Amino acid sequence: MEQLTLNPIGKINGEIFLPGSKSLSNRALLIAALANGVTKITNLLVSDDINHMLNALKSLGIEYTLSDCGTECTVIGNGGFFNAKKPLELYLGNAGTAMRPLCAALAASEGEFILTGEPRMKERPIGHLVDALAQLDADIEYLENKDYPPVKIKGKALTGNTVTIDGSISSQFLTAILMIAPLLETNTTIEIDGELVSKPYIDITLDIMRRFNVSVQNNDYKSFIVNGKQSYQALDKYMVEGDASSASYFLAAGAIKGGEVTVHGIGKLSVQGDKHFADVLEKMGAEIHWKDESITVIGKPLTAVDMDMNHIPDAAMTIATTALFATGTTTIRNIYNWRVKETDRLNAMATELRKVGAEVVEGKDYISITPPKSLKHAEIDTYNDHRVAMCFSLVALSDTPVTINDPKCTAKTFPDYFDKLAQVSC
Incomplete structure (x- = not known):
């Protein structure tokens, strides 16, 4: 051709x-949606994956305004987990970096959700996330193939305490757990068995969380100590790197x-x-x-x-x-x-x-x-x-x-x- x-x-x-990085654009959106207050996100990525994250958040009741042809998003924070009165199917296309964080937030939310995407996403395993969310008391069911999306999620008040996890093979799921865990009612200790892959991926996540006023202690990537009952606070301006x-x-x-x-x-x-x-x-x-x-x-x-x-x-x-x-x-x-x-x-x-x-x-x-x-x-x-x-x-x-x-x-x-x-x- x-x-x-x-x-x-x-x-x-x-x-x-x-333009904004994909994975930070998604994390900025989810965090600003969970936060208390109005965040202006600038340099947001304009792409199909981000548009699915925007649509998923709109479905869940989040109010935002787009400007500068989609590169600026003013988000009114929900001040905690989501509340949907009706069953939602959320289709996230090929947005791998949105998929796991949203799955975690929806497991902690009130509502019933189906989380799916393109055939490419349905071949990306999600079993480690699902096992970690089950240790938080989540209610998640595989609708097609064991350890793969799509999943059905019945949101619950999750309980933290001790979460023991394997960080060889994938670290993407940890990022999702780190984002929600501060917002739970209990404290959480996350223990990592092996050597953890993709350290910078964790560093980016903990770094954006800190900017939205939420702290987690990182013990050399072998354990994470999390205080519960935290709340993300909106930033006046946040520029997506x-x-x-x-x-x-x-x-x-x-x-x-x-x-x-x-x-x-x-x-x-x-x-x-x-x-x-x-x-x-x-x-x-x-x-x-x-x-x-x-x-x-x-x-x-x-x-x-x-x-x-x-x-x-x-x-x-x-x-x-x-x-x-x-x-x-x-x-x-x-x-x-x-x-x-x-x-x-x-x-x-x-x-x-x-x-x-x-x-x-x-x-x-x-x-x-x-x-x-x-x-x-x-x-x-x-x-x-x-x-x-x-x-x-x-x-x-x-x-x-x-x-x-x-x-x-x-x-x-x-x-x-x-x-x-x-x-x-x-």
């Missing part, structure tokens, strides 16, 4: 405004071909995991300046690195194409996570990199990249993966054009990517 050809960019320079993974492409472009780029939407107080990406560009020679709500990169000659990037696997992909512009052989280590996605991103990146003329070595969990003297013109297969398209856009910072197949695979996660890139291309 479609291809996009990007022609050689002589220089990158300018400002990029990142942009996605740090999305920042990576523009920071890399600025390091390679700048000029100066300032990415707005992510700043110095962010606790997103992929904020660590900037450190890799610094080790490569780029100059980085963190500011209150933005980060600035200034272009410098880059040198290859050999580093573990286990902590930032999405943004690490950006490093694989940035390596095409660095002196020496770049090695990205400890990225087995790339292999367990829909498509094996390790082999996919390697295959496309060889097409532009790089020498690439693939191991179980590393990739090693040696740039050619001159890049070759290629038609890049994107494997339905937004990240592959966005990484290989950086090839246009060479003397050679790049053709990207199926560029609309960006449409659901970052539709304006290519337009934003053109805004900073001179």
Whole structure:
């Protein structure tokens, strides 16, 4: 079907405004809906997943006003859990980051609810959440397949006390439990068996909760101590941070071909995991300046690195194409996570990199990249993966054009990517 050809960019320079991150947009919405008072949410993500969260909240009785074409939401807080007089079916599409938090809040609410989504969501397991909610006394039933949505929920006053949980495999469910637990009538102790995956995901959640006046004690991710009978308090203004993974492409472009780029939407107080990406560009020679709500990169000659990037696997992909512009052989280590996605991103990146003329070595969990003297013109297969398209856009910072197949695979996660890139291309 479609291809996009990007022609050689002589220089990158300018400002990029990142839209709100998906998962923080959902957390901001749910928290503001539960809070006491009026919150103005700014930089809210405009997308189909957020629109389902907005619709679910409207169904549940929450009053808000949208403005600036959906990027600003003034929410009148409900001051606690929801109350629906009639059975509601809430359809959350493919909104994974809304699904678990809402399931938790609805389990604590008064009403009867059916929670469902697209066939893609129905293949995402929910058993850990459901088991943790059952330890809080929740009443939830699988309507189709055991451990999968869709679910029927009869809301109850949940009782906290001791919740014992396994944090290897998934941490998404913990986030949902952390959000509701302060609002219960009892105190809650959450105990984690294993080593907990996705720590930054927990950090973001506890960070936004703290901004809405709710504290939880985190004991090194092995236990969480929660005081009950807390209440979220509305913020005058809350700006949804942009996605740090999305920042990576523009920071890399600025390091390679700048000029100066300032990415707005992510700043110095962010606790997103992929904020660590900037450190890799610094080790490569780029100059980085963190500011209150933005980060600035200034272009410098880059040198290859050999580093573990286990902590930032999405943004690490950006490093694989940035390596095409660095002196020496770049090695990205400890990225087995790339292999367990829909498509094996390790082999996919390697295959496309060889097409532009790089020498690439693939191991179980590393990739090693040696740039050619001159890049070759290629038609890049994107494997339905937004990240592959966005990484290989950086090839246009060479003397050679790049053709990207199926560029609309960006449409659901970052539709304006290519337009934003053109805004900073001179």
